[PDB]
Write an enzyme that holds these catalytic residues in place. Structure first.
Site, PDB file in Angstrom:
ATOM      1  N   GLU C  30       0.847  -1.184   0.000  1.00  0.00           N
ATOM      2  CA  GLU C  30       0.000   0.000   0.000  1.00  0.00           C
ATOM      3  C   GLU C  30       0.884   1.237   0.000  1.00  0.00           C
ATOM      4  O   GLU C  30       1.803   1.347   0.819  1.00  0.00           O
ATOM      5  CB  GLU C  30      -0.936   0.011   1.211  1.00  0.00           C
ATOM      6  CG  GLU C  30      -1.823   1.243   1.298  1.00  0.00           C
ATOM      7  CD  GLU C  30      -2.512   1.369   2.641  1.00  0.00           C
ATOM      8  OE1 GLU C  30      -2.596   0.356   3.366  1.00  0.00           O
ATOM      9  OE2 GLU C  30      -2.969   2.483   2.973  1.00  0.00           O
ATOM     10  N   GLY C  31       0.610   2.162  -0.915  1.00  0.00           N
ATOM     11  CA  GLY C  31       1.405   3.368  -1.024  1.00  0.00           C
ATOM     12  C   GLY C  31       0.609   4.628  -0.761  1.00  0.00           C
ATOM     13  O   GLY C  31      -0.437   4.584  -0.105  1.00  0.00           O
ATOM     14  N   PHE C  33       0.134   7.153  -3.581  1.00  0.00           N
ATOM     15  CA  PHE C  33      -0.566   7.417  -4.827  1.00  0.00           C
ATOM     16  C   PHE C  33      -0.908   6.149  -5.597  1.00  0.00           C
ATOM     17  O   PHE C  33      -1.442   6.244  -6.707  1.00  0.00           O
ATOM     18  CB  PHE C  33       0.268   8.346  -5.719  1.00  0.00           C
ATOM     19  CG  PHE C  33       0.713   9.613  -5.038  1.00  0.00           C
ATOM     20  CD1 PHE C  33      -0.170  10.351  -4.264  1.00  0.00           C
ATOM     21  CD2 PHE C  33       2.015  10.065  -5.175  1.00  0.00           C
ATOM     22  CE1 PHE C  33       0.240  11.517  -3.640  1.00  0.00           C
ATOM     23  CE2 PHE C  33       2.432  11.229  -4.554  1.00  0.00           C
ATOM     24  CZ  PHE C  33       1.543  11.955  -3.786  1.00  0.00           C
ATOM     25  N   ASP C 152      12.873   9.921  -5.184  1.00  0.00           N
ATOM     26  CA  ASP C 152      11.953   9.196  -4.317  1.00  0.00           C
ATOM     27  C   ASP C 152      12.590   7.915  -3.781  1.00  0.00           C
ATOM     28  O   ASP C 152      11.888   6.930  -3.522  1.00  0.00           O
ATOM     29  CB  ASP C 152      10.643   8.891  -5.051  1.00  0.00           C
ATOM     30  CG  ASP C 152       9.473   8.699  -4.106  1.00  0.00           C
ATOM     31  OD1 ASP C 152       9.602   9.064  -2.919  1.00  0.00           O
ATOM     32  OD2 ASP C 152       8.423   8.189  -4.551  1.00  0.00           O
TER      33      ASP C 152
HETATM   34  N1  LIG Z   1       6.821  -5.288  -8.748  1.00  0.00           N
HETATM   35  C1  LIG Z   1       6.678  -5.230  -7.422  1.00  0.00           C
HETATM   36  N2  LIG Z   1       6.956  -6.334  -6.692  1.00  0.00           N
HETATM   37  C2  LIG Z   1       6.813  -6.281  -5.365  1.00  0.00           C
HETATM   38  N3  LIG Z   1       6.422  -5.255  -4.605  1.00  0.00           N
HETATM   39  C3  LIG Z   1       6.155  -4.176  -5.353  1.00  0.00           C
HETATM   40  C4  LIG Z   1       6.254  -4.079  -6.730  1.00  0.00           C
HETATM   41  N4  LIG Z   1       5.897  -2.810  -7.160  1.00  0.00           N
HETATM   42  C5  LIG Z   1       5.588  -2.183  -6.050  1.00  0.00           C
HETATM   43  N5  LIG Z   1       5.742  -2.940  -4.920  1.00  0.00           N
HETATM   44  C6  LIG Z   1       5.463  -2.527  -3.548  1.00  0.00           C
HETATM   45  O1  LIG Z   1       4.692  -1.343  -3.604  1.00  0.00           O
HETATM   46  C7  LIG Z   1       5.209  -0.354  -2.691  1.00  0.00           C
HETATM   47  C8  LIG Z   1       5.791   0.779  -3.491  1.00  0.00           C
HETATM   48  O2  LIG Z   1       4.700   1.449  -4.147  1.00  0.00           O
HETATM   49  P1  LIG Z   1       4.888   2.899  -4.719  1.00  0.00           P
HETATM   50  O3  LIG Z   1       5.283   2.786  -6.138  1.00  0.00           O
HETATM   51  O4  LIG Z   1       5.885   3.680  -3.857  1.00  0.00           O
HETATM   52  O5  LIG Z   1       3.479   3.613  -4.556  1.00  0.00           O
HETATM   53  P2  LIG Z   1       3.381   5.190  -4.421  1.00  0.00           P
HETATM   54  O6  LIG Z   1       4.812   5.703  -4.229  1.00  0.00           O
HETATM   55  O7  LIG Z   1       2.484   5.535  -3.297  1.00  0.00           O
HETATM   56  O8  LIG Z   1       2.844   5.831  -5.773  1.00  0.00           O
HETATM   57  P3  LIG Z   1       3.797   6.636  -6.712  1.00  0.00           P
HETATM   58  O9  LIG Z   1       4.949   7.256  -5.867  1.00  0.00           O
HETATM   59  O10 LIG Z   1       3.012   7.788  -7.403  1.00  0.00           O
HETATM   60  S1  LIG Z   1       4.529   5.470  -8.090  1.00  0.00           S
HETATM   61  C9  LIG Z   1       6.196  -1.101  -1.801  1.00  0.00           C
HETATM   62  O11 LIG Z   1       5.544  -1.636  -0.655  1.00  0.00           O
HETATM   63  C10 LIG Z   1       6.713  -2.201  -2.729  1.00  0.00           C
HETATM   64  O12 LIG Z   1       7.127  -3.346  -1.993  1.00  0.00           O
END
Ligand SMILES: Nc1ncnc2c1ncn2[C@@H]1O[C@H](COP(=O)(O)OP(=O)(O)OP(O)(O)=S)[C@@H](O)[C@H]1O
Ligand SMILES: [Zn+2]
Ligand SMILES: [Zn+2]
Lengths: 165, 292, 381
Positions: C30-31, C33, C152
């Site tokens: 969970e992120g 965005f 980031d």
């Molecule tokens: N291909 C993947 N395999 C495993 N875990 C992933 C993968 N892609 C993302 N994650 C997980 O997702 C999270 C990172 O998500 P983010 O990309 O940072 O979401 P977000 O940052 O809130 O949205 P953004 O910054 O606009 S891309 C972490 O917990 C990672 O472990």
């Protein structure tokens, strides 16, 4: 800061390096509770018991090579431990946000002196704050933005390209 | 929690967010639904963002004024409270509206990346003119509980006083060392300095007011003959005095039928010129916000 | 899946074609965005084309990134464009496919298995640090040659698997590319005006709290590529310091004082001088009045000393070699002596390369390609 604000030695507006313990951030520190208590030592030791098996592969994989090109040797230490302290205790026992203008108005600053006391986020597509996301989904501007496709045109082209890659 | 201005029920943050959402998301079809006009809704004009394009053409033309219809606040759901807060407390809610209009002017070129410079926009002081604030109840049917409320009035202009300079910044000069200070007016009162501000010169009563160096603003008084929609039994028509400020000076000529929306004000009047004794019965006037 | 199953079925109603194209198992991350899910590859040409991007772990799970509709479509297009232009190395995680409906968009990426970082740092050895830093610096110098600044870099963004010992980078959604005296009176250096008329410079402030570069803190108009390298330095110092949330910022000025209490008021005034702005601090009682002139050694020394003498630190000698190491620098079986001299040499080297990894001036701060050719990284070459 006025001296009345900074009078407290525990809460300070500016960060101080009080370090701390148990993986916590050094600036906040360990104000809420102490790790020298016996009960805290017992729970930390209980988690440590679980962590031994997990830490064994961690030590064994990188003992000699960073890569997987591969029983363990460990450095003795004079300084104390959680288990020796436990033994001693047993011996004792026994959000993007909206952009706003740089400069504020004199009337706006004059209103700050008159104020007394009596899930959520910001959508950049509609450029409005919302109390709840599910209410912002059901709104005329968001649904009118969704039915329009002329603002995802670049996306559309990319979709088409990524379809025949 | 949430802060409220004393004497009111107004929050700067809540009113700012509500009016920002209103400006970003208003369509004139909302005004069509509110006025019970469904068959007159058209696609090309009503479904366009009204205040977005109005603020855009405000940016292109160099306009610093937004004419806001108060009925449009009732058209939007979230600002129905704000409408009442505009009628009950114009003095600070209008300032909130001006501040968030400035924020919106910044945002429309920050988000969309226009070529306009931010310095000219943030140097400008944008102000709003609410109008169509409600029913045109008469002057003589108003009460002292209506003081500092937004009121809308019909009338005919009979005459206007010449341009009156009301003094905003005061310029004081030392007699002996020629050191000067400028003091801003604060709610109609200017603090004259008892002592010179200089460290070297601290002579008492050495500061004299130079009337031509100090900055003034425009103030005009217009006598308006009111024509109410409803006239009680045997009510004989009267004349009000309405004060216009800054840009609105000399915008009304003698003999025109106008729609004045403004603030209901009351001040005490001195009984004698030599004495500071005021009269207990207050003099009422309209501090004009917008003229149609 | 107590309550998240309703979100899976809701996403199923959100897109009409995903049922025939994918089967989705669980929620992995969970992120802010986006929210990413793990899904079955089922049938598809994307798995067969890429193949090598998937690890030796096998079974070919596919990550599915759902983006909230609140995000601007320009940032989404920027993110997907940056992922599609780059491709190439395995560490960048290139996208397979994109699925879009009238308001929401789905990004499809190969799934890279990993475990959470709160488990690494407390017990991860220095050789693991070598592999970890090596993977991040290879991926960062790759994205530097492509011209993309990430801004980031956080431990959650970097995915690392222990039993295979490799990494991969995601979250290019906030990334972008860059292409390029005295007047009498008005002594403003002692005070600010009561009413402000001049503007505040419109920065590109978009990082996460505690990782934002000091150039970003001071809102430099010409922003370079070197936010990412200071951030990977910060991750290096958190790994060596054995403290995870080491920089936490309530606001921007809080982070400025956070940099002040380690490096010193004078050091940041010289760093501020090259940027064109002067910083003054009056009063401000703390421990080290001019910071640490020796460097980061003694700071991380008493940082470990506090949590060691308290005694809550775990029993593993994986993080006890640093205490002995730093103790002999501040104080000053033959195979045991071999392990000694090796760990001593490259463990002195990692702090050594850390001081150049923490340089204030970006022009003096060496690029990641220079970081690769340091003598510290010899055995990986
Ligand atoms: N291909 C993947 N395999 C495993 N875990 C992933 C993968 N892609 C993302 N994650 C997980 O997702 C999270 C990172 O998500 P983010 O990309 O940072 O979401 P977000 O940052 O809130 O949205 P953004 O910054 O606009 S891309 C972490 O917990 C990672 O472990
Ligand atoms: Zn929206
Ligand atoms: Zn004087």
């Amino acid at each position: 800061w006025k001296p009345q604000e900074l009078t407290n030695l525990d809460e300070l507006p500016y960060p101080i390096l009080k370090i701390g313990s148990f993986g916590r951030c050094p600036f906040i520190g360990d104000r809420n509770y102490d790790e020298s208590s016996y009960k805290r030592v017992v729970k930390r030791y209980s988690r440590d018991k679980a962590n031994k098996k997990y830490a064994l592969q961690l030590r064994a994989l990188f003992q000699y090579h960073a890569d997987t090109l591969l029983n363990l040797i460990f450095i003795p230490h004079t300084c104390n431990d959680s288990t020796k302290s436990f033994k001693k205790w047993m011996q004792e026992k026994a959000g993007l946000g909206p952009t706003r203008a740089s400069v504020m108005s004199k009337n706006m600053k004059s209103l700050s002196r008159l104020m007394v006391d009596r899930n959520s986020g910001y959508c950049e597509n509609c450029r409005v704050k919302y109390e709840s996301l599910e209410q912002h989904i059901v709104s005329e501007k968001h649904l009118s933005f969704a039915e329009n496709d002329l603002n995802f045109e670049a996306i559309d082209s990319l979709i088409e390209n990524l379809r025949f890659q | 929690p949430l802060r409220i201005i004393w004497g009111t029920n107004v929050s700067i943050q809540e009113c700012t967010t509500n009016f920002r959402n209103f400006l970003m998301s208003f369509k004139y079809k909302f005004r069509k639904i509110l006025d019970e006009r469904e068959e007159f809704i058209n696609n090309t004009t009503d479904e366009e963002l009204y205040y977005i394009k109005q603020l855009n053409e405000m940016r292109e033309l160099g306009t610093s004024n937004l004419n806001l219809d108060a009925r449009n606040l009732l058209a939007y759901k979230q600002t129905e409270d704000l409408y009442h807060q505009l009628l009950n407390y114009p003095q600070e809610v209008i300032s909130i509206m001006d501040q968030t209009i400035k924020d919106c002017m910044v945002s429309l070129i920050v988000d969309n990346n226009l070529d306009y410079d931010l310095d000219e926009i943030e140097t400008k002081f944008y102000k709003v003119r609410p109008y169509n604030v409600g029913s045109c109840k008469g002057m003589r049917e108003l009460n002292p509980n209506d003081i500092d409320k937004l009121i809308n009035l019909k009338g005919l202009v009979l005459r206007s006083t010449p341009v009156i300079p009301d003094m905003k910044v005061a310029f004081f000069k030392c007699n002996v060392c020629d050191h000067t200070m400028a003091v801003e007016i604060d709610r109609g009162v200017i603090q004259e300095p008892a002592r010179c501000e200089r460290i070297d010169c601290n002579e008492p009563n050495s500061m004299s007011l130079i009337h031509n160096r100090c900055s003034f603003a425009d103030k005009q008084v217009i006598k308006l003959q009111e024509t109410p929609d409803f006239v009680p039994d045997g009510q004989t028509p009267h004349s009000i005095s309405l004060c216009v400020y800054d840009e609105l000076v000399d915008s009304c000529r003698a003999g025109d039928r106008i729609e004045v929306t403004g603030t209901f004000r009351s001040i005490p009047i001195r009984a004698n010129s030599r004495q500071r004794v005021l009269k207990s019965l207050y003099k009422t006037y309209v501090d004009v916000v917008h003229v149609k | 899946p107590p309550e998240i199953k309703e979100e899976m079925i809701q996403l199923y109603h959100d897109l009409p074609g995903i049922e025939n194209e994918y089967k989705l198992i669980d929620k992995i991350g969970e992120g802010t965005f986006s929210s990413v899910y793990k899904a079955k590859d089922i049938t598809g040409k994307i798995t067969k084309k890429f193949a090598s991007h998937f690890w030796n772990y096998g079974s070919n799970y596919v990550a599915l990134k759902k983006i909230y509709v609140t995000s601007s479509p320009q940032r989404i297009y920027n993110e997907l464009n940056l992922l599609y232009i780059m491709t190439g190395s395995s560490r960048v995680a290139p996208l397979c496919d994109a699925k879009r409906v009238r308001d929401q968009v789905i990004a499809v990426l190969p799934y890279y298995p990993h475990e959470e970082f709160r488990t690494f740092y407390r017990d991860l050895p220095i050789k693991g640090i070598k592999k970890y830093i090596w993977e991040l610096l290879r991926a960062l110098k790759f994205v530097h040659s492509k011209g993309i600044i990430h801004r980031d870099i956080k431990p959650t963004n970097f995915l690392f698997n222990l039993e295979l010992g490799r990494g991969v980078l995601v979250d290019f959604g906030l990334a972008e590319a860059q292409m390029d005296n005295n007047v009498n009176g008005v002594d403003l250096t002692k005070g600010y005006p009561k009413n402000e008329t001049r503007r505040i410079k419109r920065a590109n402030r978009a990082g996460t709290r505690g990782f934002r570069a000091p150039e970003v803190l001071m809102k430099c108009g010409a922003q370079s590529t070197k936010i990412d390298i200071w951030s990977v330095g910060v991750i290096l110092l958190s790994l060596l310091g054995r403290r995870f949330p080491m920089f936490q910022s309530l606001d921007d000025a809080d982070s400025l004082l956070e940099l002040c209490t380690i490096f010193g008021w004078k050091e940041l005034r010289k760093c501020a001088a090259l940027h064109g702005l002067g910083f003054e601090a009056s009063g401000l009682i703390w421990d080290k009045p001019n910071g640490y002139s020796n460097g980061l050694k003694e700071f991380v020394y008493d940082l470990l000393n506090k949590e060691c003498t308290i005694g809550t630190f775990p029993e593993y000698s994986v993080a006890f070699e640093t205490f002995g190491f730093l103790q002999q620098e501040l104080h000053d079986a033959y195979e045991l002596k071999k392990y000694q001299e090796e760990i001593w040499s490259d463990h002195y080297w990692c702090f050594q390369v850390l001081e150049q990894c923490f340089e204030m001036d970006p022009q003096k701060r060496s690029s990641a390609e220079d970081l690769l050719k340091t003598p510290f990284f010899n055995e990986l070459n």
